[PDB]
């Protein structure tokens, strides 16, 4: 009897008349986090875990749920969830493939609004028709490779500019001038001459050994005296 009070509970074996017999899982448990690492010495290098981290895939707060009511489902009568996807082909470097960026939708009930999340897929195509920029429609099919389970069904928009550039021999799209950063620290352009290459190398190695010395910790207020 969940609706009955604590003192009103004469027994707990069955529900006498009807309702919902639910286990009273104790939410108020006062879970404790035990600090097992130094403040600046957490084993992970990117994300630090300093408190109780909430666990769950869909039960987390704020609530996030899939939204099947999007453009793809409005256009297509999908036999299976996510069977058909419309997206732009971005990246054509693997033979008989076409990488397509299609965006799904996730809904937040708490804020009562939706946002779009972009996901990339590998779409198989024959005769190499998919050129960069085409608005394509892809559908699920049999597994083709380790990461290929979509295939293009129709090229809604042909990239005329890309095809003409390919005919002229140039790339379908100029490569972007900005990419992923290789390292967090900034990359400084090297312009030293041949004579100064060794000096620049010495300076760089000195900087690296200083960064290694930083592992030691704070320098003592009193210099070491024996």
């Amino acid at each position: 009897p969940w609706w009955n009070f604590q003192t009103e509970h004469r027994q707990r074996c069955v529900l006498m008349y009807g309702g919902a017999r639910t286990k009273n899982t104790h939410n108020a448990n006062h879970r404790v986090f035990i600090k097992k690492y130094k403040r600046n010495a957490f084993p992970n290098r990117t994300r630090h875990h300093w408190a109780v981290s909430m666990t769950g895939v869909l039960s987390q707060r704020p609530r996030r749920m899939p939204w099947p009511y999007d453009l793809t489902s409005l256009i297509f009568n999908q036999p299976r969830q996510g069977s058909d996807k419309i997206g732009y082909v971005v990246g054509t470097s693997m033979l008989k493939t076409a990488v397509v960026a299609t965006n799904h939708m996730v809904y937040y009930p708490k804020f009562n609004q939706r946002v779009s999340r972009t996901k990339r897929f590998f779409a198989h195509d024959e005769d190499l028709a998919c050129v960069e920029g085409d608005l394509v429609h892809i559908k699920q099919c049999r597994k083709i490779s380790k990461y290929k389970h979509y295939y293009v069904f129709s090229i809604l928009e042909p990239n005329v500019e890309g095809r003409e550039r390919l005919k002229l021999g140039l790339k379908a799209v100029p490569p972007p001038l900005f990419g992923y950063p290789v390292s967090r620290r900034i990359v400084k352009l090297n312009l030293t001459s041949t004579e100064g290459t060794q000096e620049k190398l010495a300076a760089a190695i000195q900087e690296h050994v200083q960064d290694a010395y930083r592992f030691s910790g704070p320098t003592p207020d009193q210099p070491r005296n024996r």
Binding site: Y88, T118, F122, D127, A129, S154, E157
Partner: protein
């Protein structure tokens, strides 16, 4: 009109400007190319390439040197193998023996669900650290 950055371009947002500007799909496709072979049959489910091959059309983009070389190398495979097996059966038979014994001496000769898993490290992650050592990353592709 060079793409701003690779991080944004990979997610297909460079071409999303055409979608956002209202010019997403406006090209007069019939004039630039035949639209009969650029779609797919819903009843059969065959793709645009299948429709093109059924109608005798070929919508092939201009190709660079490397893809043409790949296509030629893959095409020459059967012609090379047919003559090689006849002319020099010694090495072919040795390789066949090695493969025949390799199929016996391997991992999961039975085609169960574990072996059939296309992405073994991604599917079985809980044993990737303590049980197996062959893979170091739990995922290798977009999925």
């Amino acid at each position: 009109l060079q793409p701003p950055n690779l991080v944004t371009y990979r997610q297909g947002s460079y071409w999303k400007y055409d979608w956002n500007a209202g010019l997403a799909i406006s090209t007069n496709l019939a004039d630039v190319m035949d639209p009969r072979g650029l779609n797919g049959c819903v009843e059969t489910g065959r793709s645009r390439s299948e429709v093109a091959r059924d109608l005798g059309l070929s919508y092939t983009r201009p190709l660079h040197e490397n893809e043409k070389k790949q296509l030629s190398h893959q095409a020459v495979y059967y012609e090379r193998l047919a003559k090689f097996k006849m002319e020099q059966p010694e090495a072919a038979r040795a390789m066949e023996r090695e493969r025949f014994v390799r199929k016996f001496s391997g991992m999961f000769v039975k085609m169960d669900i574990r072996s059939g898993a296309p992405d073994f490290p991604s599917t079985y992650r809980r044993l990737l650290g303590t049980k197996v050592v062959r893979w170091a990353s739990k995922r290798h592709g977009p999925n």
